[PDB]
Amino acid sequence: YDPASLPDVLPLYYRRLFPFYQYFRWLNYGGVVKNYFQHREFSFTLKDDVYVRYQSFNNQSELEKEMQKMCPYKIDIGAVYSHRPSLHNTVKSGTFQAQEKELVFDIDMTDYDDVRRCCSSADICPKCWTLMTIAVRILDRALAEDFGFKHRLWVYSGRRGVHCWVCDDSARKLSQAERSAVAEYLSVVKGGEETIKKVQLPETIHPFIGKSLKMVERYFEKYALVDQDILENKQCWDKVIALVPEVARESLLREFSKARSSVERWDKLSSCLEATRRYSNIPKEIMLQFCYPRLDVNVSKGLNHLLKSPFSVHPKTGRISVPIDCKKLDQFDPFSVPTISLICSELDNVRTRDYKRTSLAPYIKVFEQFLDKLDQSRKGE
Amino acid sequence: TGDRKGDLYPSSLQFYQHPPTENISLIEFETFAIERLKLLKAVENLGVSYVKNSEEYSKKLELELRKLKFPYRPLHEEISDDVYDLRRKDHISHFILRLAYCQSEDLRRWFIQQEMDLFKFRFGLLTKESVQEFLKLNDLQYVAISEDEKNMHKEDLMNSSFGLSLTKMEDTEFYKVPFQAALDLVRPRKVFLWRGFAFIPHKDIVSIVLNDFRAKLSKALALSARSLPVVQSDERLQPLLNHLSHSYIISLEQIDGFAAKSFPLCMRQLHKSLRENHHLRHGGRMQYGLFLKGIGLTLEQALQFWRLEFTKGKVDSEKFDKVYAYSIRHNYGKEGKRTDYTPYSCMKVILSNPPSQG
Amino acid sequence: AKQAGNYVISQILSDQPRDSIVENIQKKLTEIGENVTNGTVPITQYEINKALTKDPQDYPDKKSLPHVHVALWINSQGGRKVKAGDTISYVICQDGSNLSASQRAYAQEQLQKQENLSIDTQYYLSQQVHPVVARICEPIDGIDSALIAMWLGLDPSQFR
DNA sequence: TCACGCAGTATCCTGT
RNA sequence: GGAUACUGC
Ligand code: SF4
Ligand SMILES: [Mg+2]
Ligand SMILES: [Zn+2]
């Protein structure tokens, strides 16, 4: 993909591929609340990194128009305000307030850098994507069981991670404090680059942590012991040794000198820890420190946060921010995600059904199913 | 159910929600009112003297309830006529006392307290069966989580609440609250969340019941105070209700004495002028008020003294509360910056505002 | 408060039987109480307006005088300044400062902006509605301060 | 270079 | 004692 080719393709996509009808269905939420779509904030990033916010639109036609006119490189969705953002200058000071917004989570592979060995920075590979695969299951289950949020849209971020939009009416009316509470409840791996032991579970395992460890276990052997090989050599297993009390460290080292496979080393570590009881949760702390999602509480706490819009185009990879089907999560491949160049090649190879002829169709289908569920909830209620 | 009974009084305990509709006699009215006043005064005295969980408290309260013939124990026999009578007593007397104890906030609080105490005692005497019956008749629908759902999430609840033992947990009942209200609990992950509801722990159930009761009762008292003009016109019931609370069933005066000996000459002069003219200019007011605060005159005592002294100066009684009450409160650090202003020091008095004529 | 009082006056000066009048008054007051407790009343109705005789700086009680405080804040902001004769509108809010109401004044915009300020319902029910109503009901038999407070949800204690 | 009078009600404060 | 408001005519 040639990023110099981005300015050539962006218009066509925004003209014949961007799913505006479903997009308006989403952000309009069945028209129940008046001025809901009209008070939504958008922000655009144009060529040469020119940023504009407090953009609002009257209806789908105005949005389609101004978007096709601007051809933005980035589209971010923001809060629904007390008035129309376009007229925020006209609103008396203090009377312009963000009132409702989806509850959103951003999981970014870059935040896992201190604990992955295959890639670094913005590089991803099939060996590390399983971490995202774990996160979506660990988090989404909580959101479906502990909090009872029923309408959850998971979206690929385009490069390094995934976003989650929780759109239940209750989740859209949550205050800042309630959002911060939700984020802290879901958050376990606490600390920066200056801390080595980032998980310190108490004697009692809270049911949520038990279910997160249960989800982790299913994948741990493949991710950590086979793929990541977190015990390949001394430079790496020294870390895991650094994560357990010194008392057994020596006892482990000799054992790790006689083990040929990291699965064997894990068995040995588990046996040694079991023999050594307050430390019976130490293996769980290691698993969490290598597998549990990291959440930027600043992303989810603030109501006025602008997050990458679904079906955006990644300025560098060119991939489309496509929704991820929860059931088919295990089959999701971030490298097969349609790029803008591929879908423009597909478009120029054959009115409201043009996208069905591209590789974008199944993802718009997943989005349509999610919107159908939202409509059913709006009606039934 | 002899002659004119019904299902109007199912259970002994009640929330006193529905006012009585009967036509009773004046003698019955007075007897019921006085009897419940005796019961509530006994409750208050026993609460002051003993710990409400003490066995002495229970024994004495049972003795009083038996002496005044109020419902306190259940009976797994049926609704016997005598029992019905007792319950009727309780129901009418309560509302009569409401009419007596809604005029002033103080009174209201007192009433509420006594009623709550009595209710707690009675709940403490309810067998589990009876307890459930009560919880059903009032649509409280506590199985508050059910027992079956509690067993359903037994392990989750056990791991949720810190330091909760298996059997002790079996002895406890939880409540279901929207998670938006348990922010401080959920945030550090010390309460289980299931389907958007937190299961918050509370022997404890009585507490919840009492909370509900108190809410209701406060509301009722407000309404009664709002419906007072209709009753004041009934002379028959005015002597009773207006005075039921007063029904048999350092001192300001010594300040003058102190002025003879202990008061320094400054305060002696100020007091002499005050008693001569029943009025002091601002400087005298400040100085004397601070001094009387220093000797120990409490805010109520100082307010009473100043009110009584100034009222004789041919000024409206309401004018005092309008003007000088704030100054008196401020001298005691009750308003404004709310500072416990110290009494003037001799250096301040000498170097304070220079007195002039008058 | 003004509106409440107006309603009360409309009830007092009518020809309805006095008892009914009182009943209606009670109802309205309770309604107001609820509307405050649930925070349904429009924010515009919580404002108090006061004029400045001097410039904001000349007042030596920048803390004790609420309107002056608000004026100072406005002059500290980056907009048109407020001078003698210019009316200022302020609201009384909660911030956790535990100070007197006179020191907790804030501009309406500020309340709409900051995430720590909320309207001090108590104050408005205790020192704005209750006084006015009481003074309007003083010569009317059957209504006294205590009762009014009760109807608003306030504690009726400190009111031969 | 300025700016009408007076009678009356309501609220709030007095540390260095 | 002082200070801040704004009604009446
Ligand atoms: S001010 Fe002090 S010195 Fe003077 S009369 Fe009073 S107590 Fe005595
Ligand atoms: Mg005076
Ligand atoms: Zn990788």
Please identify which residue in the block is written with the tokens 């000799």. A254
* Torsion-angle region of B38 (φ positive above 0: left; ψ -120 to 50: alpha; else: beta): alpha
Mutual orientation of helices B282-295 and B265-277 as an angle, nearest 10°? 120
The CA distance from C110 to C108, in Å, is 5
Closest CA of chain C from A96, distance in Å: 7
* Ligand with minimal distance to A124 CA: 3
From the CA of B265, give the closest atom in ligand 1: 5
Distances (CA, A) of B249 to B37, B42, B116, B220: 8, 10, 21, 26
Task: Among B262, B263, B266, name the best residue to mutate to test ligand 1's pocket (greatest count of ligand atoms within 8 A of Cβ).
Answer: B266
Give the span between the Cα atoms of C13 and C10, in whole angstroms: 6
- Most distant CA pair in chain C, distance: 77
Residue type, B82: D
Find out whether A298 and A288 touch, Cβ atoms under 8 Å: no
**Residue A237 and residue A234: Cα distance in Å, rounded?**
5
DSSP H or E run through A152 = strand A152-156
> Phi and psi (nearest 5°) for B294?
-65, -45
Residues B226, C33 contacting (CB under 8 angstroms): no
Q: Which residues of A touch C112 (CB under 8 A)?
A: 82, 93-97
Angle between helices B105-124 and B55-68 (to 10 degrees): 100
DSSP assignment of A111-139, as one string?
A: GGGGG-SS--TT---TTTHHHHHHHHHHH
What are A80's two structure tokens? 């629904």
Do residue B192 and residue A207 have CB atoms under 8 angstroms apart?
Answer: yes
Burial of C93 (0-12, 13-18, 19+ CB in 10 A): buried
Which residues of B fall within a CB distance of 8 Å from C22? 229
The coordinates were experimentally obtained by cryo-EM
Spatial CB neighbours of A292, under 8 Å, sequence gap ≥ 6: A138, A188, A189, A199, A212, A216
Q: How far apart are CA C22 and CA C28, in angstroms?
A: 10
Is the CB of C142 less than 8 angstroms away from the CB of B229?
yes
For residue A297, which of A212, A192, A182 has the smallest C-alpha distance? A182
Give the gap in angstroms from C-alpha A171 to the nearest C-alpha of chain B. Answer: 11
Q: Among B339, B345, B254, which Cα is nearest to B294's?
A: B345
Token digits for A206? 């809270």
Q: Does ligand 1 lie within 6 Å of residue B290's CB atom?
A: no
CA distance A118 to A125: 7
Q: State the Cα–Cα distance between residues B183 and A176, nearest whole angstrom.
A: 11
Question: Is residue A108 within 8 Å of A160, Cβ to Cβ?
Answer: yes
Asked if the Cβ–Cβ distance from A184 to B159 is below 8 Å, we say no
Chain C residues inside the 8 Å CB shell of A82: 112
Three-class DSSP category at A161: strand
Alpha carbon distance A70, A62 (integer Å): 12
Residue type at position A270: S
Radius of gyration of chain C, Cα coordinates, nearest whole angstrom = 18
Integer Cα distance of B153 and B169 in angstroms: 12
CA distance A252 to B167: 41
Q: What is the resolution of this structure in A?
A: 11.1
Q: Which two tokens stand for residue B55?
A: 């066995």
Q: Retrieve residue C138's tokens.
A: 């003083």
A76 close to A33: Cβ distance less than 8 angstroms: no
**B327 Cβ within 7 A of any nucleic strand D atom:** yes
Secondary structure of residue C50 in the 3-state scheme? strand
B166 in contact with ligand 1, CB cutoff 6 A: no
What is chain A's Cα-based Rg? 23
